[PDB]
């Protein structure tokens, strides 16, 4: 299926002409991002072996999401660039949809941590058996929405045989699918920032009350500092017509800024008890 990818990469502008052989390479940034993947797989593997003893499953689910995100982007670099024209479009949907299920479950799990710290606070509703029925239905819905949204192009919703709907970052994806992903990502983002402000507004109750919780809800909002410049660029992609906005060609720098969020999540969420500080005493 090489000529199908050739026509879409000629429509987008990443392949210049029907005679030129492709040569998308740097050999600097494509070894840099591997060491970024080599740190995300190394950080998140250490989180999973360190836990053995409710507690820690939400941190363990998130570090599992960031593990597979580090595995899939390391897979994605080795199958992109000059190698991406040896791939079938059915293989191409697997390479790109593997990053929408891992990063989709990573962002959905951050919402599940947001509902967990909100639930056990001021009001114990008897609507939910909160023992293990809540922790299983959250993580089940975090991975069900991620696979459903992430594998939604390969089941049909793509720009195959409809070139004006082709995105410039993802040359086979649908711009209407991206606008579905923009509108529900912001719906995840405005949900987290109103719950995290509600948790800060509901710890004001009856040494002192130093409240470190204002200082941590700002530092966990590096999530908007890591993820929103990609979704500006997705909003640029759906809005800009083809070959008119050339900031979309440096989009791989906006991808890693969403994937360095997977490196920060072992730092932001494992500051309790300081496990690593004892775990390498000798």
């Amino acid at each position: 299926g090489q000529e199908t990818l050739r026509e879409h990469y000629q429509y987008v502008g990443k392949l210049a002409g029907r005679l030129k052989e492709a040569s998308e390479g740097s050999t600097l940034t494509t070894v840099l991002f591997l060491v970024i993947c080599s740190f995300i797989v190394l950080e998140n593997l250490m989180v999973l072996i360190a836990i053995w003893k409710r507690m820690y499953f939400f941190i363990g689910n998130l570090a599992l999401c960031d593990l597979l995100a580090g595995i899939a982007y390391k897979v994605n670099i080795l199958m992109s660039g000059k190698k991406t024209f040896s791939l079938s479009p059915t293989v191409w949907f697997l390479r790109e949809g593997s990053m929408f299920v891992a990063l989709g479950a990573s962002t959905c799990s951050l919402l599940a941590i947001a509902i967990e710290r909100h639930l056990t606070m001021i009001k114990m509703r008897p609507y939910d058996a909160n023992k293990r029925h809540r922790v299983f239905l959250l993580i089940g819905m975090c991975w069900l929405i991620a696979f459903t949204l992430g594998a939604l192009p390969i089941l049909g919703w793509n720009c195959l045989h409809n070139l004006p709907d082709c995105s410039t970052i993802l040359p086979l994806y649908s711009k209407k699918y991206i606008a579905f992903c923009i509108s529900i990502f912001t719906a995840i983002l405005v949900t987290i920032v109103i719950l995290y402000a509600r948790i800060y507004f509901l710890v004001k109750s009856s040494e002192r009350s130093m409240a470190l919780l204002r200082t941590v809800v700002i530092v966990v909002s590096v999530f908007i500092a890591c993820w929103s410049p990609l979704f500006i660029l997705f909003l640029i992609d759906v809005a800009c017509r083809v070959q008119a906005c050339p900031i979309l060609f440096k989009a791989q720098w906006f991808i890693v800024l969403a994937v360095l969020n997977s490196a920060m999540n072992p730092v932001i969420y494992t500051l309790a008890s300081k496990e690593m500080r004892r775990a390498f005493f000798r």
Partner: antibody
């Protein structure tokens, strides 16, 4: 930014040869193809051929396989097209243009070299 | 190759009228058809690439349309600097083939 300076004004005897040039500036020359288009008042716009500047690989039309010959010198960022044994049919304006980003958008054209074939 | 048949050959216009130029293809070309404008002793200057994607500096009176075989280019108000020659070209397969021409002229 992107100009295609083109060596214009030629005048050639019949049976002689001519070598035209299209000089590129404002972009990396080895990343996009160079195309050459011929315009007569009778036959209209005619495609002569194209060339990939890095790795000197060409593709022609079958009408011009034998007239036109294309080279590319990446050290000077210019492209050459050589017409050979010209008749009166070969007197036209020859444009150079690029597929800028892709063959979808031929946005940047040259200026034309007028070739008059008299004797 | 791929023959593109462009009509009309010439049409005499007065300022402010609407015109629509047709360009049909012998084959499926997709949406790779462009539209160019040429003035005397000047390069062809690209107006519309793609289905209907206006190049930078092309006004709102230029409108493209088409898919696979039938392609149109319309002018909602012909202005005085739009009086030039116009072409369509296919760009879907090398060799590139263009139309024959459409000369917009002044009506008296």
């Amino acid at each position: 930014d992107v100009q295609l300076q083109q060596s214009g004004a030629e005048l050639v005897r019949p049976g002689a040869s001519v070598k035209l040039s299209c000089k590129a500036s404002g972009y990396t020359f080895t990343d996009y193809e160079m195309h050459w288009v011929k315009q007569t008042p009778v036959h209209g716009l005619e495609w002569i051929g194209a060339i990939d500047p890095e790795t000197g690989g060409t593709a022609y039309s079958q009408k011009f396989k034998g007239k036109a010959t294309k080279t590319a010198d990446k050290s000077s960022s210019t492209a050459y097209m050589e017409l050979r044994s010209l008749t009166s049919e070969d007197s036209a304006v020859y444009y150079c243009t690029i597929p800028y980003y892709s063959n979808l958008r031929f946005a940047y054209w040259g200026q034309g070299t007028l070739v008059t074939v008299s004797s | 190759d791929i023959v593109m048949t462009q009509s009309p050959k010439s049409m005499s216009m007065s300022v402010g009228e609407r015109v629509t130029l047709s360009c049909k293809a012998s084959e499926n070309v997709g949406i790779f058809v462009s539209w160019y404008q040429q003035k005397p002793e000047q390069s062809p200057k690209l107006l519309i690439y793609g289905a209907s994607n206006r190049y930078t500096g092309v006004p709102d009176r230029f409108t493209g349309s088409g898919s696979a075989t039938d392609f149109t280019l319309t002018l909602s108000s012909v202005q005085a600097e739009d009086l030039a020659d116009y072409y369509c070209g296919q760009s879907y397969n090398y060799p590139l083939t263009f139309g024959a021409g459409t000369k917009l002229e002044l009506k008296r």
